[PDB]
Amino acid sequence: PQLPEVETIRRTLLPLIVGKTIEDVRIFWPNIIRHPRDSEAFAARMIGQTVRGLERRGKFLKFLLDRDALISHLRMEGRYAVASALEPLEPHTHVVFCFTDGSELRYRDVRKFGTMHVYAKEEADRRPPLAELGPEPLSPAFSPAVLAERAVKTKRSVKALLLDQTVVAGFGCIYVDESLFRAGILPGRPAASLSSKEIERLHEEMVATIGEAVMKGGSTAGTFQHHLYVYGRQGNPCKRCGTPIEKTVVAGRGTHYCPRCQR
DNA sequence: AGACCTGGACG
DNA sequence: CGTCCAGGTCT
Ligand SMILES: [Zn+2]
């Protein structure tokens, strides 16, 4: 999940958990728990607290409790649902938070890649993983100046630049590829080879793409996949020029682009 | 890369 | 059967 997907999980999950009080926390795959590293301390400190809110920072979910904040990263497969304690669990359910009202927040993750960190609220933003994060793309803090400051300094591909969460938070392969297309820029271009005119353009497209995806509930629930120009369309005609979309490897990752529209 | 991980589209 | 992919991030 990327920013648009997570922002959607955030909007729909909040009303389902807000004001509930944790009675128990049950863990079935401890590796998910990263801080405290001991999964028993993790469970213990949360018992008794009440969900006060739910925020998003980059690709992370930030559950706001009483004194603590829980930082959850879904990675590839992480999924949350709220259900009755009286029903059997779905498979691949690794962490369950039991509330006093008989309902449960269930976390599922087939590949077990996801992570959970719990800190005191005041500590969350100055500790891993939130600390190194770049500006929110839909915030004024994300500007062409910001993008340019990082681009000139590096020799790596513009794709690799935008995937770096320290540069800007929220983009993954899908939306990076789409943004680059919309901005007419080849993914493999050295970041530094970008001009001021391209930087501004890319910034406008990055903001627009992520914005529309969020309004459309993301890609699959979501509907933004009907609005994909290049991702997963390899071999198919470009929607703008009819050139077959191409797929190669940029920075070790499957990359999609139109060889005509992008330069 | 290869790491952690599990499973679905491929012949 | 296998291998080849997969919307993350780390080493
Ligand atoms: Zn094209």
Question: For the residues of A222-253, what is the DSSP string, one character each?
Answer: --GGGG-SSTT-TTSBPTTT-PBPEEEEETTE
Nearest to A7 by CA among A174, A229, A169: A169
Question: For the residues of A85-129, what is the DSSP string, one character each?
Answer: TTSPPPTTEEEEEEETTSEEEEEE-TT---EEEEEEHHHHTTSTT
Note the CA–C1' distance, A115 to B4, in angstroms. 12
* Residues 6+ away with beta carbon under 8 Å from A257: A177, A180, A181, A186, A187, A230, A245, A246
Ligand 1: centre distance to CA A93 (Å): 43
Our CA dihedral for A143, A144, A146, A148, rounded to 10 degrees, sits at: 170
CATH number of A133-263: 1.10.8.50
Q: Where in chain A is the domain with CATH 1.10.8.50?
A: 133-263
Strand C contacted by A225 CB (< 7 A): no
Q: Is A183 helix (H, G, I), strand (E, B) or coil?
A: coil
Instruction: Tell me if the domain spanning A1-132 has CATH number 3.30.565.10.
Output: no
Interatomic CA distance for residues A17 and A30, integer angstroms: 23
Nearest to A203 by CA among A189, A218, A221, A185: A185
What is the resolution in angstroms? 2.6
Note the CA–C1' distance, A80 to B3, in angstroms. 25
Interatomic CA distance for residues A1 and A4, integer angstroms: 8
What's the sign of the alpha-carbon dihedral A56, A64, A166, A110?
A: negative
E strand or H helix at A146: helix A144-151
- CA end-to-end span of chain A, whole Å? 28
Measured from Cα to the C1' atom, the residue closest to B2 is A252
Question: For the residues of A58-92, what is the DSSP string, one character each?
Answer: TTEEEEE-SSEEEEEE-TTT-EEEEEETTSPPPTT
User: CB–CB of A224/A217 below 8 Å?
Assistant: yes
Nearest nucleotide to the CA of A32, by C1', is B4
Q: Where in chain A is the domain with CATH 3.20.190.10?
A: 1-132
Q: Solved how?
A: X-ray
Nearest to A105 by CA among A70, A66, A68, A60: A70
Protein contacts on strand B: list nucleotides below 7 Å from a Cβ. 1-2, 4-7
Beta-bridge partners for A21: A50
Nearest to A36 by CA among A153, A145, A154, A115: A115
Which residues neighbour ligand 1 (ion) by CB within 5 Å? A 238, 240-241, 243, 258, 260-261
**What single DSSP character describes residue A190?**
B
